[PDB]
Every structure is written in C-alpha cells, then in structure tokens.
C-alpha cells in the first residue's frame, strides 16, 4: 500500500482481475479423483430445499 510498513500484498488496478489465493485439504488431494482434465472438470453437486 501507500506506506510499506506491514502491508505488502499487491494491489491490482483492475477490479475484474483480482489476485485470489487457493487452499488445499488432505481429502480431495489424497482421496479424491483428479477430475480437472482437458475437456471437462467434474465437480460435486449440492441441493438445497425450499
């Protein structure tokens, strides 16, 4: 930011192109299938009632 004392994260000048960190979990890296292939990405499905 303006003063580089504690805050060192980059600020992006375009609202649309933000930097976004990604996390990981043990299940999902270890127990899940690698379903991010070239022609499809398979992802879980969730259902909520009304």
């Amino acid at each position: 930011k303006r003063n580089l004392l504690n805050e060192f994260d980059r600020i992006i000048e375009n609202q649309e192109k933000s930097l976004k960190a990604s996390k990981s979990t043990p299940d999902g890296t270890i127990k899940d299938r690698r379903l991010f292939m070239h022609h499809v990405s398979l992802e879980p499905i969730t259902c909520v009632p009304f």
């Binding site: 299940d27 127990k31 899940d32 499809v40 879980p44 969730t46 909520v48 009632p49």
Partner: protein, 220 residues
C-alpha cells in the same frame, strides 16, 4: 380391541413421519454448509444416523406416498447428497456407510420408470458425488449389476433422471483403470443406443450431456 390397536398404529406412523419430515428437512436445509457436514460426521452419531437412513428409504420405497413420507425420504436423500458433496463426506460414506450405498443402488432398481422421479435424482446425485472419491468410484462401478442399473434408469422418460444418469456415466467412463477387462468391451456394455438417441433430444441440457458423453466414448 383389534380395531383400537390398528387405529393408534396408524396414529403412531403419522406422528413418526411428521417428526421425521420436520427434523430431517431442517437438517437437509443446513447440510449445504461444509461446517455442518463436518459437524455431522463428528462422532458415532453419524454412523447410527446413516444406518437408520438407509432403512427408512428402503422401508418407504417398499410400501409402493403422501406429502409427509415423501418429504421425509427426500430429506434423507438430500442429506446424503450434501454430505457426499464434501470431500471428507464422500470419504466417510465409502469407508463407513457402504451398506447405505448398497441400499441406494438397490432402491434405484426397485423404482419403476416414472415413480418417485425426484427421489431418483437425489439418489443419483449422491452416487455422482461419491464417484468423485476414488474408493467411491471403485465400489460403485464394481457393484454387481451397476451397468444394468444404468440401462434400467435410462428407461425413465423424465429428462432430469436421464440427465443425471448421463452425469454418473460421464464420471465413470473417465477412469480407464477400473474399466471391466477391455476398454472397448466396457464401452459395448453401455446403453449406446439410448445415449445416441438422447444426443438428438429436444431438451437442451440433456442433448448436450449425451452429445459430450458421446465424444468421450468415441475417443477411447
């Protein structure tokens, strides 16, 4: 005396399904949260719940439902789906609730095409979610009669049931290692005629599902 016994037997069932529908709908409502799923899996209470869940779905399907019992089983099927949507939930179900997975597979075969269409979709969704887990895909696709079940389900004229069958098929064919013997022989066990027919369907989502599934099959 006989009539009095039968009378409050009916009165006990309607209260039971009322409590079941109320409690489990609240649970289904909040089970979309990852933290709620993790909390549910906490303890042995998860085990006893999923055990009694499979029994109830089975007990109700065998009775073939009023709006009470039907909402009850919808909630049970919805909870299982949302648990399975979380990585540790699908991992828990294949390690600790294979009996319930069996029941779900069994019940999909008991329901004739056109009965409990929404219950089938929910159950098909849970199977799809479980198939994302690697042990879950193995247990499902090794289940005896799994491929015949797909043909049986694709005989339902409801487009949403067929869309979700093709989703499950899409999941299974992307893993060549578990393929039954020869990959080309496994392709021949799939309902290719029905898939090709659906690749020319009026429903846009179902047409695209079948058409994309057709592409994956031709390139193996």
């Amino acid at each position: 005396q006989l009539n009095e016994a039968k009378q409050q037997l009916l009165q006990q069932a309607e209260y039971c399904t009322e409590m079941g529908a109320a409690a489990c709908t609240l649970l289904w409502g909040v089970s979309s949260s990852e933290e709620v799923v993790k909390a549910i899996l906490g303890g042995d209470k998860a085990l006893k719940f999923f055990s009694i869940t499979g029994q109830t779905m089975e007990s109700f399907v065998k009775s073939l439902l009023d709006s009470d019992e039907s909402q009850f089983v919808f909630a049970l099927a919805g909870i299982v789906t949302n648990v399975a949507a979380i990585a540790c939930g699908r991992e828990f179900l294949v390690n600790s609730s294979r009996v319930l997975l069996d029941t779900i597979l069994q019940l999909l075969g008991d329901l004739k095409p056109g009965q409990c269409t929404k219950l089938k979709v929910l159950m098909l969704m849970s199977l799809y979610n479980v198939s994302i887990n690697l042990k879950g895909l193995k247990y499902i696709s090794e289940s005896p009669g799994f491929i015949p079940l797909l043909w049986w389900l694709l005989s339902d004229p409801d487009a949403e049931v067929c869309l979700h069958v093709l989703r499950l098929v899409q999941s299974v064919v992307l893993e060549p290692e578990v393929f039954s013997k020869s990959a080309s022989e496994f392709r021949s066990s799939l309902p290719l005629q029905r898939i090709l027919a659906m690749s020319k369907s009026r429903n846009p989502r179902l047409q695209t599902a079948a058409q994309e599934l057709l592409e994956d099959l031709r390139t193996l």
